[PDB]
Amino acid sequence: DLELHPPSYPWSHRGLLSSLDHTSIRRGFQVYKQVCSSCHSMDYVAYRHLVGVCYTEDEAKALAEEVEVQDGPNEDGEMFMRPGKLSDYFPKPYPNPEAARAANNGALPPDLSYIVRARHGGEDYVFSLLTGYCEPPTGVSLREGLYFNPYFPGQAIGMAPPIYNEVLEFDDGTPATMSQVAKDVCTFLRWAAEPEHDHRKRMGLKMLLMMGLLLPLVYAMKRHKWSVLKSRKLAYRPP
Amino acid sequence: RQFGHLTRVRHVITYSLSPFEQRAFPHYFSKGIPNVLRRTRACILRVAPPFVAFYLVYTWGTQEFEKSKRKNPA
Amino acid sequence: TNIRKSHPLMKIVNNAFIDLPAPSNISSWWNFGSLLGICLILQILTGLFLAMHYTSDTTTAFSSVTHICRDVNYGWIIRYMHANGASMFFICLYMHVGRGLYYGSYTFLETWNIGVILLLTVMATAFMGYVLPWGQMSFWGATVITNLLSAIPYIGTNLVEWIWGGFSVDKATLTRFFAFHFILPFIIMAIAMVHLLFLHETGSNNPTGISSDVDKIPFHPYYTIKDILGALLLILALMLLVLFAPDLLGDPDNYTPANPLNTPPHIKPEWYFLFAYAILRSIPNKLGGVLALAFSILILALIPLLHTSKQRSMMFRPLSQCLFWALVADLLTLTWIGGQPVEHPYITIGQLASVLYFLLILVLMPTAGTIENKLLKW
Amino acid sequence: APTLTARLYSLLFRRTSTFALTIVVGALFFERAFDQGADAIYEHINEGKLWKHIKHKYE
Amino acid sequence: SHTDIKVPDFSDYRRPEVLDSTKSSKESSEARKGFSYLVTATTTVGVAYAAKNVVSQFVSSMSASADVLAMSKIEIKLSDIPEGKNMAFKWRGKPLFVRHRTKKEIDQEAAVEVSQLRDPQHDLERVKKPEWVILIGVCTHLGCVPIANAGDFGGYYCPCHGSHYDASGRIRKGPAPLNLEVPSYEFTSDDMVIVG
Amino acid sequence: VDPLTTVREQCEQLEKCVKARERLELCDERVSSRSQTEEDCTEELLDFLHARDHCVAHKLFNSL
Amino acid sequence: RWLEGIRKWYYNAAGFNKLGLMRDDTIHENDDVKEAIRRLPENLYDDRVFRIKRALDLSMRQQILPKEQWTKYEEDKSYLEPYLKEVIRERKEREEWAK
Ligand code: HEC
């Protein structure tokens, strides 16, 4: 039970005032859609959330219409299935957690909405996990259905290596290498966990500037009033 | 107790200037830098020694936890 | 013949805020009182706005907190202001107490004891606040900490189940924790006004520890302008966290919902309790550990009785100064050890730090005072 | 040649009423200038990264 | 004597403008106040900008969130409703009736008596497009869901108390006070309608 | 095809990496040589990967 | 005697002398000290008042006197001793009598 902690990759959003790469978010979404969304849920993200971030209103309407979702009841009192809308959330693979366990040999695949924020290391951690799958060292073997990852705690994970070269073609025609696919999906998972990212940092800059102005001004006002006392001379004149 | 009822003082003169007649930052770096060094040198080996000791007990205990979790050559 | 001294309401404002006689020489360490006030108002506002969107039902609770951060307009900036605001509070508190200890302000007995009460109530508030999101650390933290009361002989086990309102931390626990977390800040508000009411009997101590009646200045404008500058610096610290590192002072495990089966690896309270969490784990016996955790805070009530020095402030006292800064460094060590797993050598370091904490307060700093006196022919 | 600070005093700062009207006017002109200026600094720092920059590709 | 007191030298602390003891300070007084009051005035303009932002954000908090705005409007496809028949939807937790009307129903609801109605409204100002009538499917008296293409006046009828609505949605014979509710809407393209 | 496996090789030919690789190969042919001992070689692999993937991080992104 | 070396060192370490204070200026004001102060002659009292005023003004500025102006160890008169000693002697007699 030793530990190998992830290294610090130079993300395009690493700096204090650096925004998320939104074209990387557009790719990363597709990596969730094509690869993850049949195993992992992502409950807090709806189809409307994508508008003005990585897709237009018309694009996100098309993406929503593509998926099945239950709705009801109706005049006769029955639960029907309908095409999705913008107001619908991203659909869960299974109906419940107990169903999910059966499909993955006892393991329950975690919801991905906050996975960047819920793990030590964040996007640095997830990227290392996805690309770090390797063959076990000598003297090592786990029970059938448990793969070797050096970045997972306890050195053994129950997830089959999900990303490889040419896993899915991209909409903008970026060459889909394993490293490229991991980089994009992490950028998306970052935005999933923290949608505020870009606004937060815009506010940060405006705060630093206003403080840069107000702090020396108020400090000058302080010194002004106090100058009566700082300058003063005392004289003791007993008769 | 208000001003006028505080305590008894005799034969003490106080002179002062209006803040509109004077500067907010007189000799700020000139006299300020050396006064700061004086203040820092005065308290340094009261304040600093315990925090040096913390740094040492910290860095000792951290890599002792790492050594212990490694395998022993026997 | 002004209407500042005349009007029944303005009179109280004029005497406690404008024309108050203040020592000429009080340092930056006297700003923390005013800043604690700002923290309290800040928590209440942001808190009230969060309560407009939150629900205390176990199923919807975690979801409501995320709903604030995602769908409510500027709900995220409100939410992280409130969480980092709680940290800024505890920074302000420990600085405020440190000042009292070093400059011997604790001689103002009533003021001091009401302080101890205030501290304890803020602790109680913040403990129940961190439960409200209903994440892993929320649920598992509350479980272990509460369940320590079962270590009381005869009654303890009943007491725990009465606080919970069941056999574990469940639906009834979360709803009542929301009600107590709402009411308590307002009780703090009241106790804080009694705190100041006693302070205005004597007025302020200063860094010298020598009486300042010969050199008082009016609060306005001298200290009103200082307090503005201080407030501005507090806002900078808060906003630097909120806008550049909002998760830095938390724990990741509170981003996954509460699971009564799946235990987090190293369960721990929030940073400002870690010193006392380490003292608890120093003692091997459980009831012993609970009595030590209680005495680690309550010892503040003992401090004025332990005073030996003929001088009030530590300003003119070298030996005491060093022992004080030793006690500070020791507390930093207990906070570190509090965050660590129970193993070699963290066990031994923790034991040694806990012994040193009580040794410094009950034996070393009293002896140091007496040695200092006999060096001055006193 | 009455200095510029002196002009500012006689024309804006002497009557408290004009001092306050100055602050209200100034705050309007400051807000628009500061916001426009600071946003430019941010969007140049993050050139081609934002939805605002990549919008044209899908319209 | 008290004449032995002479005021200490304040040269080190003075502003440059008031250093010369043989010149009158009165020239520089206009300026010296100007500078210091500018600092105060600048500070206030800055604080104004900040406080405006903090306040206005908190006000925004209490206004409708993104998910409430998501259910605000509902889109309906006009080629999906056959001329003559009614079609119902769920909107702000309540039924919503859209009805394509025939040239028979247009002319028959045009020349109705305006005074005889309990709630006097002409048809041309209840709706925009003549071939289309949009209404909330809630009975105005005590809240039911009216059944389409039925009743005496050939429009909507209620089996709760005894109300009869015409093809334009107006009350003709019953206990209901006001006519069926006309929501706020606009046609987008000739094929689509957005209600809300 | 992947920029990743190119860079993993480039970094592997550093003295800190190759010294750690040799350490890995010593217990490779030390656990395998011995029969019936519960001791394995996880530690040595992680030592290697730590040194390798630190370097990989520093310049992998350039090709993305 | 032998510890006079340490007493002289401690005096300067403690450092109230750098503000132009004597030892008895630094004594914490309880009820006995209050009475002792109240019993001082005009001269001794007004001196005490000035010395403290001076120190407080220096403390306000975060400054010290020139080294020439510092209270020398040998020149530190114990001005409050005879008044304070008798104030305490008096109280202990009343406390005894009340038993
Ligand atoms: C067919 C199954 C399957 C696919 C495909 C899959 N996962 Fe998972 N995933 C799992 C299972 C099962 C676990 C739980 C493993 C465990 O706890 O040992 C898991 C765990 C994870 C974890 C948690 C690791 C931790 O620190 O505990 C992350 C992050 C994750 N998956 C992300 C992804 C991403 C990103 C993709 C694709 C781009 C993906 N998964 C594809 C089944 C899958």
Ligand code: HEM
């Ligand atoms: C909600 C928490 C608290 C608030 C709002 C508060 C408020 C204040 C304020 C405004 C002052 C005057 C300004 C100052 O000297 O800082 C003050 C002074 C004081 N407080 Fe607190 N306080 C709080 C907690 C405490 C605690 C926990 C203690 C001690 C355990 C304490 C002890 C004191 C003392 C001794 C003084 C007098 C300081 C002096 O004159 O030198 N207070 N408090």
Ligand code: HEM
């Ligand atoms: C001394 C004052 C207070 C302290 C120290 C305090 C502390 C806290 C803390 C630490 C949290 C958890 C923050 C998080 O991790 O998300 C919290 C949550 C909360 N507090 Fe407070 N609080 C205070 C006052 C108030 C008041 C007055 C209210 C309401 C009137 C309030 C309402 C809430 C609500 C609704 C939450 C849950 C939402 C959230 O998690 O952010 N609090 N509080």
Ligand SMILES: CCCCCCCCCCCCO[C@@H]1O[C@H](CO)[C@@H](O[C@H]2O[C@H](CO)[C@@H](O)[C@H](O)[C@H]2O)[C@H](O)[C@H]1O
């Ligand atoms: C270059 C020098 C290298 C330094 C050598 C460091 C490692 C060698 C061991 C040094 C001695 C410390 O050894 C350590 O002591 C502590 C303190 O009692 C023990 O702790 C044990 O006893 C205490 C007694 O109160 C119990 O509370 C605790 O439950 C138990 O674990 C550890 O089990 C032991 O591992």
Ligand SMILES: COc1ccc2c(c1)N=C(c1cnn(Cc3ccc(OC(F)(F)F)cc3)c1)C(C)C2=O
């Ligand atoms: C340094 O020495 C002293 C001495 C005496 C006192 C003191 C400091 N600070 C006080 C104090 C209390 N809170 N604050 C900050 C503050 C918080 C909220 C607020 O809201 C309002 F609505 F505008 F009023 C205003 C101010 C300052 C008081 C009472 C006080 O008697």
Ligand code: FES
């Ligand atoms: S309820 Fe249908 S009309 Fe009265």
